[PDB]
Amino acid sequence: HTSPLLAPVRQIHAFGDSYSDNGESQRLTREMLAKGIAGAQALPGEVYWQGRWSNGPTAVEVLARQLGAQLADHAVGGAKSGADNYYGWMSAYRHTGLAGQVDAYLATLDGKPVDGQALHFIFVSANDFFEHEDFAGEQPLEQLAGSSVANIRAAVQRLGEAGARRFLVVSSTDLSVVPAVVAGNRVERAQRYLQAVNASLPIQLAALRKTRGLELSWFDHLTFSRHLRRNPARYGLVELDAPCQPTQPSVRPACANPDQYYFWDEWHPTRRVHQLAGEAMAARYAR
Numbered sequence: 700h701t702s703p704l705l706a707p708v709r710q711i712h713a714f715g716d717s718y719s720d721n722g723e724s725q726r727l728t729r730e731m732l733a734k735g736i737a738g739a740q741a742l743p744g745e746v747y748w749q750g751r752w753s754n755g756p757t758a759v760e761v762l763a764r765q766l767g768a769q770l771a772d773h774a775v776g777g778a779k780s781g782a783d784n785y786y787g788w789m790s791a792y793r794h795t796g797l798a799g800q801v802d803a804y805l806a807t808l809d810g811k812p813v814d815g816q817a818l819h820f821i822f823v824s825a826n827d828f829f830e831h832e833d834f835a836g837e838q839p840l841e842q843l844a845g846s847s848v849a850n851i852r853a854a855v856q857r858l859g860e861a862g863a864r865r866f867l868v869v870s871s872t873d874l875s876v877v878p879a880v881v882a883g884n885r886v887e888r889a890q891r892y893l894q895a896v897n898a899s900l901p902i903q904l905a906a907l908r909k910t911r912g913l914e915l916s917w918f919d920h921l922t923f924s925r926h927l928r929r930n931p932a933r934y935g936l937v938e939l940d941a942p943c944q945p946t947q948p949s950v951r952p953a954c955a956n957p958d959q960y961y962f963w964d965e966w967h968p969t970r971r972v973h974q975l976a977g978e979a980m981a982a983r984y985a986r
């Protein structure tokens with residue numbers, strides 16, 4: 700049986716990674732290139748739509764359109780749950796991890812008041828895992844998961860302390876079906892990591908609800924994806940595993956039917972999956 704709808708939303712502040720970014724990695728990397736920062740690359744690049752790491756709007760942009768809300772999207776492609784980014788060359792210029800996004804958002808308010816009606820959307824952790832796998836992190840995956848969860852909890856606590864009262868916290872995605880993870884033969888590693896994050900984060904959200912009357916909504920992206928992938932024809936999908944736009948080891952021409960694909964590139968869903976995710980997220984809120 701469904702719960703009562705939550706209150707209407709008219710402002711979202713989004714924090715996170717490439718699954719949310721609507722143009723910050725593009726704006727920041729053009730700035731970094733214009734200033735000659737060492738190692739800077741133009742992100743996301745020439746096979747991506749309008750600075751999104753996809754072929755269309757991200758889920759949080761769809762959530763904002765469905766709710767009739769303005770969106771301030773702080774998310775940066777590559778962001779980890781702590782201070783920094785998968786792209787280590789960004790650190791010398793800006794701390795673009797979740798903790799850095801929160802810092803910058805609170806610094807851009809004077810001593811000014813966080814809007815207690817705004818929805819603070821948090822969607823991060825994938826790059827904690829991608830950086831560990833790609834650069835041979837020595838932390839056991841269960842410890843990496845605990846770090847990701849502690850960093851998310853810390854961001855919620857800091858935003859709450861500053862005045863935030865409403866949150867939407869997104870689970871880990873199904874990293875085990877991400878094309879790059881499958882090609883790397885890292886499926887069971889991804890499963891252990893994502894299950895540890897997803898088991899522990901709801902326990903931390905219960906603790907945080909004890910304080911400040913926080914509204915801490917949880918979106919289980921794994922439940923969402925498992926349902927879509929088990930019933931793909933219902934949603935017009937056909938190809939669940941191959942990227943529409945290959946980039947590894949090199950760029951190849953995009954598929955002709957991208958709205959029938961789950962994945963855009965080796966890491967990121969298509970606009971169609973972002974649309975379905977944002978509609979699923981919006982279903983808990985009144986208009």
Ligand SMILES: [Cl-]
Pocket residue numbers: 748749750
């Ligand atoms: Cl562009």
